[PDB]
Amino acid sequence: KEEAQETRAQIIEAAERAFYKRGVARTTLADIAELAGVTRGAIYWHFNNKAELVQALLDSLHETHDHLARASESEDEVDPLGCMRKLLLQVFNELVLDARTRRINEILHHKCEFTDDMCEIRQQRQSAVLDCHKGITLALANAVRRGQLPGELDAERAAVAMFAYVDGLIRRWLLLPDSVDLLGDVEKWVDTGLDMLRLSPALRK
Amino acid sequence: TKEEAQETRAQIIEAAERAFYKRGVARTTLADIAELAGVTRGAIYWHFNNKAELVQALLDSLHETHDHLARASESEDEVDPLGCMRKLLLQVFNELVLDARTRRINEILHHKCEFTDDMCEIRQQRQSAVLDCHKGITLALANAVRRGQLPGELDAERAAVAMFAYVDGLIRRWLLLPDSVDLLGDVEKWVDTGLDMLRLSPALRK
Ligand SMILES: O=C(N[C@@H](CO)[C@@H](O)c1ccc([N+](=O)[O-])cc1)C(Cl)Cl
Ligand SMILES: O=C(N[C@@H](CO)[C@@H](O)c1ccc([N+](=O)[O-])cc1)C(Cl)Cl
């Protein structure tokens, strides 16, 4: 029950609407609280500040891909590349179909400044990205151990090349959706990225 | 013409950069730049109507340093369009790593500028600019295909979107975590990796 565990989910939903409408920079807890139907104190009970909320939205994105990620990263996975290809297809699908994922991504890329007032936001991002980076490198190592991608493949650099590509593609669809048939052509887009990892000599040390 | 005005504009723009960088585009009024640049408010209004007008000016300063190579790389009469495109991206990354002004505007563009219904002109311009850039990379690519620099069957369109995506994300990665990408030392590698995808990826063909 009680007071309400699910109040925490109600506050997050309102934080999404507020951030999407006014942007993170100019949203205050008061705004969010009025929007949720609660008091600032009810927000303070779940979050110590605005950075914590942003954090929660960020963190929510990882859930849906949890299993597919852990799969690719694991040593005992027979088909590590196959899991990464699967995950990317999910990432792009969730992005195109789920208004929730779209909005949080929109907030993250286009509605969330990095300013000296909440270095917390930029810090959250940095570590979030280094994390994702570590994960990516691990997967690349596994695909190599299994000869799914060329032997002496500079993992670190390919990881960055991957993340960059995917990241910029997401941001591109966000800015101009009707100029990237992301849904229909998911296969191509994902593979374009994947092809780079194996066919590109520049990524080979 | 009056040199007095041309100097005041150059000062508004310099201060906008320093402002937007520290406080961000969202919570920064034009009045704030007036005090920062040491100029009358109405003067900024003479120079720039709304804040979006200024942001636009910052975005613009970026294309100056590359206009030459960009044009060359698009020209149908250009003998080595892929070489041009290569040299251009090299000249983009160098200026990023070396020129603090360029780094700051990109940081503003990527990390300090929100899209809100209040200021929709910022998003519209941002869309306009990327469509501009887009049309650019397509011509260039097509010209490199036409000259057997790339695979004949390449899809210029998608290929352009891919490359831009790759270039845009890398810049951002470096702004967020500079001490990760040795963009200065490995510069040629990063430029090549992107290009390799354009010519080697079978998913980009047809
Ligand atoms: O799913 C995510 N990122 C995708 C799409 O950008 C991708 O970059 C990614 C691929 C593998 C990975 N690894 O399994 O942890 C993490 C992220 C985020 Cl939830 Cl980190
Ligand atoms: O970084 C920039 N442009 C990138 C976009 O990917 C660069 O790759 C580019 C610029 C112009 C261009 N066109 O004019 O030929 C093509 C690519 C500008 Cl914002 Cl300075």
Residue numbers in the entry:
A (entry chain B): 6 to 210
B (entry chain A): 5 to 210
Give the original sentences from the paper that presented this experimental model.
The structure of TtgR in complex with chloramphenicol was determined using selenomethionine substituted crystals and multiple-wavelength anomalous diffraction (MAD) methods and all subsequent structures were determined by molecular replacement method using the TtgR/chloramphenicol structure without the ligand as a starting model. The structure of TtgR in complex with chloramphenicol was also determined at 2.7 Å resolution. The TtgR structure is almost identical to that of TtgR in complex with tetracycline. Chloramphenicol is situated similarly to tetracycline and utilizes the general hydrophobic environment of the side walls with little specific interactions. In the case of quercetin, naringenin, tetracycline, chloramphenicol, as well as additional phloretin molecules, binding occurs vertically in the binding pocket with little specific interactions. This binding site is broader, more exposed, and contains less specific interactions. We therefore term this site the general binding site, which most probably contributes to the versatility of TtgR's ligand binding property.
